[PDB]
Design an enzyme around this catalytic site. Structure first.
Site: not given
Ligand code: QT2
Ligand code: ZN
Ligand code: ZN
Ligand code: ZN
Length: 231
Positions: A83, A85, A87, A148, A179
């Protein structure tokens, strides 16, 4: 045995072999005052490797390529982001500079552009409707519906019965919703039902963050999502 968040310093990447020719990659990132682990997948495709998801950022993804070269020694020729985001796409520019062909659905590429995130080069066709599946090298890619995120894909490795759920699937230790800013809470349980129906034979289910388990992680995620919905 599976590396836990507490065992990986930010900047390093661990590989965990799940099956013949199937590994997970595990990295960490500090975000909003806490440290989070993040999973992706590596699947052997003959004498090449298919990568699923970056290691969450340029620095981690550069380290991931170095660790793959050291431990496996086969070239990463393609990568799919599941996806939009950071990560999942953060590090796409690193992969591209190293000659890896990067792929995502057109819906992921659009949302990454809107977000200002890195954008995989190639567009995966045939994944626009819930329940759609396409073969991509040694894996099947499946769009289960919005969960998600609107665009989330899951990945199945038929030779090893490995289901990679990405961030649409929660690890068991996660009892509160994560998130969910980009989620479709209303559709997420139905999307999970589609995964269950399509991959009932899965033996190893990998969440986007945290410890793998079995198919019980799907019902777990539904429970957590429904609880959040009723919050
Ligand atoms: C970089 C910003 O964050 C992310 O790319 C994610 C995407 S799923 N967001 C999650 C959140 O905010 O809890 C996470 C586990 C931190 S990873
Ligand atoms: Zn995500
Ligand atoms: Zn994630
Ligand atoms: Zn549970």
């Amino acid at each position: 045995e599976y590396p836990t968040v507490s065992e990986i310093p930010v900047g390093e990447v661990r590989l965990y072999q799940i099956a013949d020719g199937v590994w997970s990659h595990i990295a960490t990132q500090s975000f909003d005052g806490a440290v989070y682990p993040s999973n992706g997948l590596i699947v052997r495709d003959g004498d090449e490797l298919l990568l699923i998801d970056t290691a969450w950022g340029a620095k981690n993804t550069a380290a991931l390529l170095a660790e793959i070269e050291k431990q496996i020694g086969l070239p990463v020729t393609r990568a799919v982001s599941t996806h939009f985001h950071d990560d999942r796409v953060g590090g796409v520019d690193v992969l591209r500079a190293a000659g890896v062909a990067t792929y995502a659905s057109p819906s992921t590429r659009r949302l990454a552009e809107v977000e200002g995130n890195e954008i995989p080069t190639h567009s995966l066709e045939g994944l626009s409707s819930s329940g759609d599946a396409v073969r991509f090298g040694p894996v099947e890619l499946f769009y289960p519906g919005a969960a998600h995120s609107t665009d989330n894909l899951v990945v199945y490795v038929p030779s090893a019965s490995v289901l990679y759920g990405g961030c649409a699937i929660y690890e068991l230790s996660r009892t509160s919703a994560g998130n969910v800013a980009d989620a479709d809470l209303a559709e997420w349980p139905t999307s999970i039902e589609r995964i269950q129906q399509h991959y009932p034979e899965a033996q190893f289910v990998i969440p986007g963050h945290g410890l793998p388990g079995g198919l019980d992680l799907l019902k777990h995620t539904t429970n957590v999502v429904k609880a959040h919905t009723n919050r």
